[PDB]
Amino acid sequence: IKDAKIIFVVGGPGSGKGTQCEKVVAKYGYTHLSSGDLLRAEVSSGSERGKQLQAIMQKGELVPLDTVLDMIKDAMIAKADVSKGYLIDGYPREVKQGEEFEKKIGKPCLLLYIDAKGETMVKRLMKRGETSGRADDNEETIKKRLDLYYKATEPVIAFYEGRGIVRKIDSELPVDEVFKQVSTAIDAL
Numbered sequence: 001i002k003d004a005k006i007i008f009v010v011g012g013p014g015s016g017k018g019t020q021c022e023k024v025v026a027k028y029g030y031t032h033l034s035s036g037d038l039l040r041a042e043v044s045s046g047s048e049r050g051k052q053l054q055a056i057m058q059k060g061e062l063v064p065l066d067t068v069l070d071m072i073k074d075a076m077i078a079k080a081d082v083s084k085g086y087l088i089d090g091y092p093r094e095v096k097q098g099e100e101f102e103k104k105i106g107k108p109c110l111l112l113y114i115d116a117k118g119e120t121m122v123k124r125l126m127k128r129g130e131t132s133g134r135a136d137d138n139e140e141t142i143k144k145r146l147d148l149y150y151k152a153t154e155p156v157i158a159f160y161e162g163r164g165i166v167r168k169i170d171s172e173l174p175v176d177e178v179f180k181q182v183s184t185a186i187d188a189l
């Protein structure tokens, strides 16, 4: 799995990470791994761990590194012989997550920084909340997730800027405008 291209996709809640990753999959055939999807899947399994994860996620807090990195590595290994590239969506969310990923799996080739305005993100999450009804899309939890992104996850961007692999994606544009930037960054690999 250290063999393949590893792309980190990092951005605030509702910035458009998942949407852009799925466009990348259809055009490039990369493997999309969502830390969020992996966790929600554990929740719906009925496990005690899933119940613990559910409580944390509904509060808009960070799940512990050990759990989420376990599941990321698990998933990378399961898809290992069909993937010539990974999109790690929503990991890392703190500097220590990036470091432990590198120590235990491998270094990323690229970090796509999905950059949206705070209000735009609130709007989108408020709108999805009224539609899908994800438990963490209620108004107060949105604010907790947003404030947490700013505190814990923005330093991840600084870290990988020092590495030199961050490409900033203007995610305020229409979805297809955003994807043109994403495509441009991926082609220049």
Ligand SMILES: Nc1ncnc2c1ncn2[C@@H]1O[C@H](COP(=O)(O)OP(=O)(O)OP(=O)(O)OP(=O)(O)OP(=O)(O)OC[C@H]2O[C@@H](n3cnc4c(N)ncnc43)[C@H](O)[C@@H]2O)[C@@H](O)[C@H]1O
Residues within 6 Å of the ligand: 011, 012, 013, 014, 015, 016, 017, 018, 019, 020, 034, 035, 036, 037, 039, 056, 057, 060, 061, 062, 063, 064, 068, 089, 090, 091, 092, 093, 097, 124, 125, 128, 136, 145, 171, 172, 173, 174, 175, 178
């Ligand atoms: N590494 C980790 N470490 C510790 N804990 C972790 C963790 N990862 C997860 N967790 C825990 O799990 C929880 C959820 O994590 P996670 O599942 O990763 O959710 P999230 O980070 O909050 O992001 P979202 O899925 O809500 O939105 P998105 O950024 O992917 O945008 P999307 O494409 O869906 O679209 C958003 C909406 O806007 C729309 N939209 C997208 N792009 C545009 C656009 N250009 N224009 C207009 N609308 C757009 C979309 O259609 C959609 O309706 C976390 O809060 C945490 O508790």
